[PDB]
Design a protein around this ligand. Structure first.
Ligand SMILES: [Mg+2]
Ligand SMILES: [Mg+2]
Ligand SMILES: [Zn+2]
Lengths: 81, 96, 150, 181, 129
């Protein structure tokens, strides 16, 4: 295809692209609100967290780091901000 | 890991290096932990831990000799034993 | 790419287009600095302070909130380490390899890796000297490296 | 007239400050409108019979205005009908020194003309945030900026934008187009 | 490493025009690249082009109209006296009636005929025809 709108890529194919290969690079990661099951305390956690974040109230691990996105422990619910 | 923990204490907390200062620090009850090098003589060692027994002071047995204990503390000389008087920014006392 | 390899990896962070704080960020530019200094006194270097801040405090970038880079803030409070963090970790790894070499002299691969690590130390240390981050007479000595890091 | 940080304010400047001495009446917003001050009010005519209101503010006081600007713009535009209100800081631009110029102190980047014009274009759309800028270089020789705005708080400005482009044309001489993708 | 962004910029355009594409994305941008394209655009060898802001060096999208035979840089940017321009136009351009050598002179970036009109010379920067 010789003629193409490079300035307006289809947003579907733009999202399958690598994160550095869009027109303007933009991270695909985000920040989350973690509700532990034990208590009710908003704790802001990065989606790709490298730390075993613990909430202030109880010294319980909220998430465990993995190769990519952190894995939330059971009973912890997140909502993306 | 504890070498790193101990290093924070050398930077921020208070300590005395050496047998004569350590026994004095055990006598006044101002010693919080006694660190003994691996190649320390048993006679001097079993006496340091008898002083600590009277003083109710924990003893940590460093695995290296007086040459490696000195360089962990950022010193260019040998340290056969040392006492931590005030653990500062570290949590070494909470990690034995 | 890859100064000391044949790799051509491109993995890195992708900073967002926005240079302003998120609307949901509620902490002040003040509260982050005492948080930053608090962690620096725990012995954390600026890299590990920034990871914990975004990992546990939602601080995406300290610059978009506070206005200054993290190391610039410690240096303004007399908490900047004498040796910069990346150079410290290069020297510390080189110290570790040589201690392993002294017990395993036939590990000819580790001798090769050590030459790469130390060459990386001298090139970066030469840079820190031209910009007066290190004294002009600062020189890396293999014998005394363990004092600086241990 | 104490609100105005300028000598001999015009009658329009007095009326705006006269509005400023009336919105603290409701105490929900009174504890902070006293320290707020401004230097000048430049006003131009946009098409459609409306008139553009540019409030010029000392740069250190801008972050104080932003705490109530969302509210403050809607009520001052009601008090003054058919008026489009924006708040800009009167940043100072230092000209680029010539080759044989006498040496002065190093010009910080915030005082450069590109940075200041990028700034007034951002103060122009305050409730919204900029998500992208593009510049077309047309075959005729002229150049047009394009600014893409976020849909959040779009309702505060989405009915204007045309006022912003002509007002920006007044300050810089350049053409701009605001778009909400 | 990346030593000349203008050489990289023209190479992407050069390869797309040869393959018949009518548009090209350029990364990264710069002042010299933008002004090099304006000279080509002023003489009609390219169409409208677009600058994309990424809070970085920048990006460009160029519309090609198929009229461009070749555009290129000259590395290094040799110093050219006014009497040496003729030798350069002879070596680089297909004829005496068309084509342009782009120079960067203290009077600005310009083609060799505009440079002759205003009687200035600088360093050679590239060519287009
Ligand atoms: Mg690469
Ligand atoms: Mg090499
Ligand atoms: Zn919890």
């Amino acid at each position: 295809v010789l003629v193409q709108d490079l300035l307006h890529p289809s947003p579907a194919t733009e999202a399958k692209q690598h994160k550095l290969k869009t027109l303007v690079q933009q991270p695909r990661s985000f920040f989350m609100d973690v509700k532990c099951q034990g208590c009710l305390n908003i704790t802001t956690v990065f989606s790709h967290a490298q730390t075993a974040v613990t909430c202030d109230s109880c010294s319980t691990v909220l998430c465990t780091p993995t190769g990519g996105k952190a894995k939330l422990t059971e009973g912890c619910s997140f909502r993306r901000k | 890991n504890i070498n790193s923990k101990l290093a924070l204490t050398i930077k921020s907390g208070k300590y005395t290096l050496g047998y004569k200062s350590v026994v004095k620090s055990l006598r006044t009850g101002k010693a919080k932990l006694v660190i003994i090098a691996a190649n320390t003589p048993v006679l001097r060692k079993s006496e340091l831990e008898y002083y600590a027994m009277l003083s109710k002071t924990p003893v940590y047995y460093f695995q290296g000799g007086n040459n490696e204990l000195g360089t962990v503390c950022g010193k260019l000389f040998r340290v056969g034993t040392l006492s931590i008087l005030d653990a500062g920014d570290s949590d070494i006392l909470s990690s034995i | 790419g890859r100064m000391h390899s044949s790799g051509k990896g491109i993995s890195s962070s992708a900073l967002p287009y926005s240079r302003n704080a998120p609307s949901w960020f509620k902490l002040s530019s003040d509260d982050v600095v005492e948080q930053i200094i608090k962690y620096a006194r725990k012995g954390l270097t600026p890299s590990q302070i920034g990871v914990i801040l975004r990992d546990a405090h939602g601080v995406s970038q300290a610059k978009v909130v506070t206005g200054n880079k993290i190391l610039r803030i410690l240096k303004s409070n007399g908490l900047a380490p004498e040796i910069p963090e990346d150079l410290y970790y290069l020297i510390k790894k080189a110290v570790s390899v040589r201690k392993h070499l002294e017990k395993n002299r036939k590990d000819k691969d580790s001798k090769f890796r050590l030459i790469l690590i130390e060459s990386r130390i001298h090139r970066l240390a030469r840079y820190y000297r031209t910009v007066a981050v290190l004294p002009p007479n600062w020189k890396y000595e293999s014998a005394t490296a363990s004092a600086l890091v241990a | 007239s104490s609100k105005i940080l300028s000598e001999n304010p015009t009658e329009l400047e007095l009326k705006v400050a006269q509005a400023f001495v009336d919105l603290e009446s409701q105490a929900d917003l009174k504890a902070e409108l006293r320290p707020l001050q401004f230097k000048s009010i430049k006003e131009i005519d946009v098409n459609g019979g409306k008139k553009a209101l540019a409030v010029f503010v000392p740069p250190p006081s801008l972050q104080a205005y932003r705490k109530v600007q969302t509210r403050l713009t809607r009520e001052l535009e009601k008090k003054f009908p058919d008026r489009h209100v924006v708040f800009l800081a009167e940043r100072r631009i230092l000209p680029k020194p010539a080759r044989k110029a006498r040496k002065q102190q190093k010009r910080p980047r915030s005082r450069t003309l590109t940075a200041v014009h990028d700034k007034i274009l951002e103060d122009l759309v305050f409730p919204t945030e900029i998500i992208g800028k593009r510049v077309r270089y047309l075959v005729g020789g002229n150049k047009i900026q394009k600014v893409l705005l976020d849909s959040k708080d779009s309702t505060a400005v989405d009915y204007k934008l045309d006022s912003f482009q002509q007002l920006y044309s007044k300050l810089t001489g350049k053409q701009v187009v605001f778009e909400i993708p | 490493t990346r030593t000349s962004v203008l050489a990289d910029a023209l190479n992407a355009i050069n390869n797309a025009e040869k393959t018949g594409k009518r548009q090209v994305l350029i990364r990264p941008s710069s002042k010299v690249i933008i002004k090099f394209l304006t000279v080509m655009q002023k003489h009609g060898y390219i169409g409208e082009f677009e600058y994309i802001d990424d809070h970085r060096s920048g990006k460009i999208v160029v519309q090609l109209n198929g009229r461009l035979n070749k555009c290129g840089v000259i590395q290094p940017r040799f110093n050219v006296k006014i009497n040496d321009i003729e030798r350069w136009t002879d070596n680089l351009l297909p004829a005496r009636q068309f084509g342009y050598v782009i120079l960067t002179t203290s009077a600005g970036i310009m083609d060799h005929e505009e440079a002759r009109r205003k009687h200035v010379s600088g360093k050679i920067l590239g060519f287009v025809y």
